[PDB]
UniProtKB/Swiss-Prot annotation, chains A, B:
Organism classification: Viruses, Riboviria, Orthornavirae, Kitrinoviricota, Flasuviricetes
Membrane disposition: Peripheral membrane protein
Protein name: Non-structural protein 1
Subcellular location: Secreted; Host endoplasmic reticulum membrane
Disulfide bonds: C4-C48, C105-C154, C116-C137, C138-C141
Function: Plays a role in the inhibition of host RLR-induced interferon-beta activation by targeting TANK-binding kinase 1/TBK1. In addition, recruits the host deubiquitinase USP8 to cleave 'Lys-11'-linked polyubiquitin chains from caspase-1/CASP1 thus inhibiting its proteasomal degradation. In turn, stabilized CASP1 promotes cleavage of cGAS, which inhibits its ability to recognize mitochondrial DNA release and initiate type I interferon signaling.
Known glycosylation sites: N32
Domain of life: Viruses
Modifications after synthesis and translation: N-glycosylated. The excreted form is glycosylated, which is required for efficient secretion of the protein from infected cells. Ubiquitination by host TRIM22 leads to proteasomal degradation.
Quaternary structure and interacting proteins, as annotated: Homodimer; Homohexamer when secreted. Interacts with host TBK1. Interacts with host USP8. Interacts with envelope protein E.
């Protein structure tokens, strides 16, 4: 009952490339030493549960490791994972159209530093004034960095914080999955 | 090492049908009340383990519920199951080309009755003399019966035994997975 409509789901693997898809989601994974989320295009967020019947590699998964949360129809799959990242409960899920993308936001740099702040809600790379924040960090995430390409610009994964900018003056997601 | 070559596996679900495939195996499943094995065509048998990365719905399976054995590259999947049947360790895996089909062998009928004998090595529907054995049973399997279509004719799943003919005068599989 809680389950997404399986009549319009399409999942396929061949070789080193895979996709979980439905009417609104296109979730690409790839084999690069290990299986990992490669990119996703999300058209309209929904709250149903992606059925395991239409999911690749559903066993041995920590729910907290899924990039796209279970509650937002994230596949319960090793294909919906990425080393150094956990579930993006507070991603910019308000955006109508979203791209999850492993690349630095334009004009920004991310450093891996134990000194960084902890994961909080996704921050956008530009202030409300429109100023680009150049330096970011994460404590133990992997490069290239998880980023979200949205209607209002580029947002960073929960792991990724401004390196010196005070978290106060930035735009943050008020969604919680 | 133990694992089948993934560069060649193609697995896909759309709606109520799925297929796990590679160079030699074509394994179809369907949603019909539950997800179940529908048919399989196996060009040549092999002994490797089908990787879970290329497998749908891999969690909470007991291995002895998988129809095609794990050791014969059977996918560790709820799509490789069928109610009333367990792992066909002693199927007629010697046959070249081979088709798993849920249908009575020609000229034969199968009765579900607890008085049947217990499961054993797969038996062919024709004696060595070429004579069709009409009446078969199984203790608690489901219809249509699990059968194998091979080069030398039609074989039955391990659960399906001759009703009255004394199994001694029949062709058994000499194969164990």
């Amino acid at each position: 009952s809680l389950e997404c409509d399986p009549a319009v789901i399409g999942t396929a693997v061949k070789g080193k490339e895979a996709v979980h898809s439905d009417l609104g989601y296109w979730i690409e994974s790839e084999k690069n030493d290990t299986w990992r989320l490669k990119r996703a295009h999300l058209i309209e967020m929904k709250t149903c549960e992606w059925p395991k019947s239409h999911t690749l590699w559903t066993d041995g998964i920590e729910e907290s490791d899924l990039i796209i949360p279970k509650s937002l129809a994230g596949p319960l799959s090793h294909h919906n994972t990425r080393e150094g990242y956990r579930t993006q409960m507070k991603g910019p899920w308000h955006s109508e159209e979203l791209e999850i993308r492993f690349e630095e936001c334009p004009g920004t740099k991310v450093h891996v530093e134990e000194t960084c702040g902890t994961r909080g809600p996704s921050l956008r790379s530009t202030t409300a004034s429109g100023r680009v924040i150049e330096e970011w960090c994460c404590r133990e995430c992997t490069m290239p960095p998880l980023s979200f390409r949205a209607k209002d610009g580029c947002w960073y994964g929960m792991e990724i914080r401004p390196r010196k900018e005070p978290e106060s003056n930035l735009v943050r997601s008020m969604v919680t999955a």
